[PDB]
Structure 1
Amino acid sequence: DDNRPMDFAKDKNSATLWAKKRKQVWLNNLSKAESTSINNYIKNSSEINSYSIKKKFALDNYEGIETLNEDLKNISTAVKKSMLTKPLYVYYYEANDKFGFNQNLESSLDSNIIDEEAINNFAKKISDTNFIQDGFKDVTMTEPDINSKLPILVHLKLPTNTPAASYGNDEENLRVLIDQGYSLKATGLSIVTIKGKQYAKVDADLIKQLNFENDVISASQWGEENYAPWLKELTSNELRDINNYLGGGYTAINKYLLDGTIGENTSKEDLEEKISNISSALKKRKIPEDIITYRRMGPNEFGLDLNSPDYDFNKVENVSKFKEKWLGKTIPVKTFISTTVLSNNISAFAKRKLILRLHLPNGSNAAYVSVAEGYKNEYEVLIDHGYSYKIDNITEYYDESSLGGKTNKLIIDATLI
């Protein structure tokens, strides 16, 4: 029950009373599998969250580890039994990395003090961005009196209905477990002093973006519902040249857009005609709400060869190089952008190491082209040529599967602009 403030602030006694009361009931409402899985999270959260990432980006017929699948499912159903009846502010310390920001926030002259230039740049970086939150998240009810090393204090507002369960082995320092599927949107920034030391306080809202990840059924229903009319209403030439692009025409078309190259069993005129028809098609029904889309990018899309030493992300140095190079950069895109609404890996591009996770905003000129017959299983959203995207974050994970290439891969969170 929620007969409490929205923000316990520094009032640990109240927060504890509320939490104890909630948690006891919640625990009595759990299955033994659910119970087991929450205790698993207590023991093993890091492994479970890492695993959720490996799993969502894996190929279709990836089996994984059974007990961890159970933990994903059971933790989620468990916490859904503890939904908030009103908003709750929660707290956690955080590092630069989680905001895709690689400038030191600490002043070079005084360790207790935030650097002014850095915090201003930070202010820019955290704006105009929905930070996807992978895995589950556990947070504190109160401003934590721990002498944190970390530069950032997140003050996160959980909305009404958020599954957020009171849990932990210490009844006097119960934590809050937040269900996966959410993103973080900054609502304010300030410097605060805690025990003589400054922190960048990021006020943010927890929000939920459309993001099907592995939910093929939902993704298909959404694509059909929003773009079937689009398909039926195409002009004959638009339908023809979209069909051509999809059927393998994309290579020549996108190459022409990239660097004007014309293999001349075609003409500049024909290439221009197909591009103009596909583009006009893509302007016909703007993306109706923000949606996360995905692309397995080849190394060339970032100036790399398959055999470039820098492409070797199994060395930490190269991941660092890549992060320093591309973090926060704006990438102009002359080509059409083929994406999918699924996080699933794709056989034909199974070993590609760069995974674009692109925030595709409402009003973008793009279409779910997989409504077209014979393409239902591609789950593809095609974006118009000429856009750009900014890189919000670069996050590595190890794809241990052989078909995936036994390699670290980089989840590149980006926003279309």
Structure 2
Amino acid sequence: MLDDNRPMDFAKDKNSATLWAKKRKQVWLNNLSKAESTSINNYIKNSSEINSYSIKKKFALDNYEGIETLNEDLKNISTAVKKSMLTKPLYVYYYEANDKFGFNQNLESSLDSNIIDEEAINNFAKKISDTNFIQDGFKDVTMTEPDINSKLPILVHLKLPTNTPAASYGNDEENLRVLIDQGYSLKATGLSIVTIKGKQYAKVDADLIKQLNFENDVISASQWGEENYAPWLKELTSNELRDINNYLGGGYTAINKYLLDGTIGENTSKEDLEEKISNISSALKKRKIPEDIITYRRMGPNEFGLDLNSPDYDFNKVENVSKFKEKWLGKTIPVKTFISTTVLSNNISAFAKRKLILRLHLPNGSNAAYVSVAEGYKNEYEVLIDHGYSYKIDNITEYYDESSLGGKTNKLIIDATLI
């Protein structure tokens, strides 16, 4: 009922925005548990810390204790906002940085700070297409077109669909914000220039979408693999099953080395390698990925032309993160090798200290399989991707892994699209 006579978009009508939010926020607060009241209060005081923490937690090792009360806030904020789901779409607004669209070209013209550079905006148009932008942590927004200057170059005009958990909160009763639950992504649906207060901003029209992404959800992940790839396991020829099994159990080292640059062990044969590759690849073509899905990979430095002892690989120095972002952002990288990925965001013991975390949008219809359906892959959550695809690099986001086992280092989250 609270959405009855509001529009989908309040535009600049700050007064209508307020009336709607007030009645909504009052009812929602009286529906909260004390633990939820407290956690939403914590989100007002330090939303940044909480959101940063959600990232650390999801990419952690299994035995990650973390910080107790922020585990609580993560849960309570999530259950809180689910008590305030929209009954019809709501457009919302917020100023945004270059970073969140993986864009590092200045959008301002050099001549007039009020005027957007034409070639910049053209590259931006290319860059934001064919990409779902994952939004980490919670996202709080506003109800109307901002009326004040921004130092940021972009205005996002974001459509929240029906049933989005989206709660009215805040200290300023005449400018209540909207608190959006975890787990969502952004898909652009338009680009234009808007002029607010004499200045031009790049306006991104976008839809808020939900991609399948299990993060730490082990029960859901495996249930998905079983349902979608047990028949696949049934149909494997003997040799296909054998050589998938060889690959998985340690054969990958020699197989991907060979795919990468043709290396053969002296006791190894060329023909054995080619036969193994042909049986694995043929297997990976038998049942296309049935729905868009995020998968993850702890990547070694060699995958970006870096050695473990290369100086450029020290991401604890600000300068090295910048030159890496300079080098790979927007780039398409061919992948000659099979790609071992995991559908869980969890760090993995054998690869705990790798600094490069792939977060891959794996499209419907890709030649890949949930191989851990096979017997004796308890605790394995692998999707294996056919060789010869490519990475479109969408974004690079740093976070700091404080853990002793993780390597007490900054690490780079590489959002990418398989093409």
Q: Using structure 2 for the length normalisation, give the TM-score.
A: 0.99
- Secondary structure of 1:411's partner? strand
Query: 1:2 touches 1:86 (CA, 8 Å); kept in 2?
Result: no
Q: Is the partner of 1:226 in helix, strand or coil?
A: helix
TM-superposed CA distance for 1:265, in Å, is: 1.5
Q: Deviation digits for residues 238-285 of structure 1, max 9, x if unmatched?
A: 011101111101110011000000002121100000000000000000
Query: What is the deviation of 1:375?
Result: 1.1
Q: Report the Cα distance in structure 2 between the residues aligned to 1:367 and 1:223, rounded to whole angstroms.
A: 9
Change (3 A) 1:36 1:365: same
Q: What SS does the aligned partner of 2:379 have?
A: helix
Which SS does the other structure have where 1:414 is aligned?
Answer: strand
- Deviations along 1:143-188, whole A, 9 cap, x unmatched? 0112111110000000000000000011100000000100000000
1:150 and 1:346 mapped to 2: Cα distance? 37
- 1:151 paired to 2:123: no
Find the counterpart in structure 2 of residue 202 from structure 1.
Answer: 204
CA distance in 1, matches of 2:221, 2:389: 24
1:135 and 1:2 map into 2 onto residues whose CA distance is: 30
2:388 match: secondary structure: coil
2:268 maps to 266
- Residue 115 of structure 2 is matched in structure 1 by 113
Q: Report the CA distance between 1:2 and its aligned residue.
A: 3.8
**In the TM superposition, what whole-angstrom CA distance separates every residue of 1:13-43 from its partner, at most 9, and x where no partner exists?**
0010000010000000000000000000000
Cα offset, 1:3, TM superposition = 2.4
Structure 1 residue 370 displacement after superposition: 0.4
Q: How far apart are the structure 2 equivalents of 1:135 and 1:60?
A: 19
8 Å contact kept, 1:2–1:84: no
Cα deviation code 1:88-126 (max 9, x no counterpart): 000000010110000000000110010000000000000
Following TM superposition, by how much is the alpha carbon of 1:226 offset from its aligned partner in structure 2, in angstroms?
0.2
Give the Cα–Cα distance (whole angstroms) in 1 for the partners of residues 373 and 51 of structure 2: 33
Cα shift at 1:378: 1.4
Q: Over residues 346-396 of structure 1, what are the superposed CA-to-partner deviations in whole Å (9 max), with x where a residue is unaligned?
A: 000000000000000000000000001111311000000000011000000
CA distance in 1, matches of 2:266, 2:377: 28
Deviation above 6 Å: which 4+ runs of structure 1? none
Q: How does 1:46-65 map to 2 (within 5 A)?
A: 46-65=48-67
CA contact (8 A) 1:30 1:78 kept: yes
What SS is found at the alignment partner of 1:101? coil
TM-score for both structures, normalised by structure 1: 0.99
Q: Name the % identity.
A: 100
How many residues end up aligned between the 2 structures? 417
Counterpart residue number, 2:91:
89
CA drift of 1:403 comes to: 0.2
Structural RMSD (CA) = 0.5
Name the SS for the 1:219 alignment partner.
helix
For residues 33-60 of structure 1, the C-alpha deviation after alignment (integer angstroms, 9 at most, x for no partner) is 0000000000010000000000000000
Is the alpha carbon distance of 1:2 and 1:343 closer, same or farther for their aligned partners in structure 2, counting shifts above 3 Å?
A: farther
Q: Which moved more, 1:405-414 or 1:297-306?
A: 297-306
Which residue matches 1:11? Answer: 13
- Counterpart of 1:377 in 2: which secondary structure? coil
- 2:295 is paired with a residue of what secondary structure? strand
In structure 1, C-alpha distance between the alignment counterparts of 2:104 and 2:376, rounded to whole Å: 45
Alignment partners' CA distance in 2, 1:416 and 1:120: 23
1:395 to 394, 397, 414: 397
CA distance in structure 1 between the partners assigned to 2:364 and 2:147 by the alignment: 41
| Counterpart Cα distance in 2 of 1:410 and 1:24 | 41
The more displaced of 134-143 and 261-270 is 261-270
Task: Tell whether the 8 Å contact from 1:390 to 1:416 is kept in structure 2 after alignment.
Answer: yes
Cα displacement string for residues 63-109 of structure 1 (whole angstroms, at most 9, x for unaligned residues): 10011000000000000000000000000000101100000000001
Instruction: Give me the whole-angstrom Cα distance separating, in 1, the residues matched to 2:353 and 2:253.
Output: 19
On the 8 A contact 1:2/1:18 being kept in 2, the answer is no
Q: Please tell me whether the aligned partners of residues 93 and 150 of structure 1 are also in contact (alpha carbons under 8 angstroms).
A: yes
Runs of 5+ consecutive residues of structure 1 not aligned to the other structure = none
Cα offset for 1:338?
0.2
Q: 1:141 aligns with which of 137, 143, 154?
A: 143
Distance (Å, rounded) in 2 between the aligned partners of 1:303 and 1:190: 37
